[PDB]
Amino acid sequence: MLAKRIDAALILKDGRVVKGSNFENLRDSGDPVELGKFYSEIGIDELSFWDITASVEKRKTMLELVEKVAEQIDIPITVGGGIYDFETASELILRGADKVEINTAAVENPSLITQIAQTFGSQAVVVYIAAKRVDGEFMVFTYSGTKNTGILLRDWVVEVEKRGAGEIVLGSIDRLGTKSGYDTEMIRFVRPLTTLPIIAHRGAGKTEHFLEAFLAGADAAKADSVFHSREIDVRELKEYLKKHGVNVRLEGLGSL
Amino acid sequence: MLAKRIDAALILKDGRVVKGSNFENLRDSGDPVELGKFYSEIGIDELSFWDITASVEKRKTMLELVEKVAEQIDIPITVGGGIYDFETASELILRGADKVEINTAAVENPSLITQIAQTFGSQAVVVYIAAKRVDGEFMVFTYSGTKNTGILLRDWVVEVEKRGAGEIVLGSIDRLGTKSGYDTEMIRFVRPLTTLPIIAHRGAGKTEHFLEAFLAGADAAKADSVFHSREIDVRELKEYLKKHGVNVRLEGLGSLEHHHHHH
């Protein structure tokens, strides 16, 4: 695990990949597990399954989903999107999730971090932090990036490591749906504040953005639509990065 | 509307909490600084430090105490006692107090509310109203609730908001000493009479008493002996209230706890 990480996130509803995928080589462009296996074959280091299901069958779905996933995929799996207490987080990990991601419930009850960590280790705990520039300060947002909590990002980050979280995903609301690049200002702002691994998210549109994120000190880089749309090939992305001195794991590939 | 808040009040003499506390985890369970600090770390939302020292040989000493309290406590601080004029209140606010709590002075000079206010903004002004039933009438008492001032609560409540107070603590003398609940009849009588934060005091004896108070329209609930004695645990109180639909703050829970195992 000595390298920078390249993660692929998948947005799900009722067990389905939202807006699908541009991969016509597969059997099904909306099947989470098939897309997952595929990315794992070609170079993705970790996968994020982010459920926005809301139907009274949410729990059951994500649970059944993690059953098939751990069967067929061998790279670490993370799952998030409305996990609100230890019990829900526990049923997922026991089921096969290597890591559970929390955000809004963590912000409102930070003991939830410690609870999971106490049992499963910090390694099992991912905290997604969605932030936005507001009145000249970086501020924390909950409930799908809808609610301004009033909490400052530099304060939340320190509290997050103190409570025993294992890594932080830094999602810039200021980059939602943009293809101009990762929020490197934010990333460099957050780097001195914590010793945890920092996973960059939102803004990526071309291979150079990734090198930029890593220069700013990100330890990992998540993206979604730009992978599923085929705007950026993952192997090509890793080869580009390797060519320019970034430590990325190839030679676990050699699939050539 | 805001979250409902849980306040802890500490009574002090000569820099010590009168009757101490039952948290044996503390180095000195009678240290108001160590005790206030611990409370901020386990769930309490705001603190109150009430002095009943007599000799003002400790006025300068009380000032040195909110200094060290403000310095190390990261939640809102109310101070109260034998406070009788604008300079006694201002020095405390400037020493580090977030709010100052007045009673008998207020009634005897209502513009004292206004004086404190025109400088430090309304929010720094808490008016404690001690009321009880006289001939089937809510009446205001001063001098430690020992003097019937002749003033109706309903008239006093309203004037306190005109003068410019920041919030109101409603303390039922008809419940003093008892642990059979807040005076929820009294809270419901005052609710439509003002727009300020209403804080309930006197009577709390068990967790369901706090639910009751909030259903009455109180915005906060203050207590003392029942937390200090640990007859009610603050974490368990917050959790019960959340369980039954109350919007309370959970962010202070578990602050002192970690993900390791010390045997």
The secondary structure of A57-74 as a DSSP string is -HHHHHHHHHHHHHHH--
Domain boundaries, chain A: 1-256
Instruction: Please give the span between the terminal C-alpha atoms of chain B, in angstroms, as a whole number.
Output: 44
**Whole-number Å distance between alpha carbons of A112 and A256:** 44
Q: Could you tell me the two tokens for A230?
A: 């085929």
CATH of domain A1-256: 3.20.20.70
Nearest to B41 by CA among B10, B72, B9: B72
Task: Give the technique used to solve this structure.
Answer: X-ray
Residue from A104, A111, A152 whose CB has the most chain B CBs within 10 Å, to mutate:
A111
B3 secondary structure, DSSP code: P
Q: Which residue has the tokens 């001063």?
A: B142
Neighbours of A197 (CB within 10 A): 15
CB A42 within 8 A of CB A82: no
Closest residue to A109, CB basis, from B253, B258, B261: B253
CB B63 within 8 A of CB B92: yes
Interface of B with A in 244-263 (CB under 8 A): 250-251, 253-254, 257-259, 261
**Whole-number Å distance between alpha carbons of B197 and A187:** 41
- The distance from CA B185 to its chain's CA centroid, rounded to whole angstroms, is 20
The secondary structure of B154-191 as a DSSP string is HHHHHHHHHHT-SEEEEEEGGGTT--S---HHHHHHHG
Neighbours of B261 (CB within 10 A): 6
**Neighbouring residues of A240: CB distance < 8 A, sequence distance ≥ 6:** A207, A210, A211
CB pair distance less than 8 Å for A111 and B258: no
Interface of A with B in 120-159 (CB under 8 A): 121-122
Question: 3-class SS at B1?
Answer: coil
CATH of domain B1-263: 3.20.20.70
Report resolution in angstroms.
2.0
Q: Could you tell me the two tokens for B263?
A: 């045997």
Nearest to A120 by CA among A150, A95, A146: A95
Tell me the sheet residues that pair with A222. A7
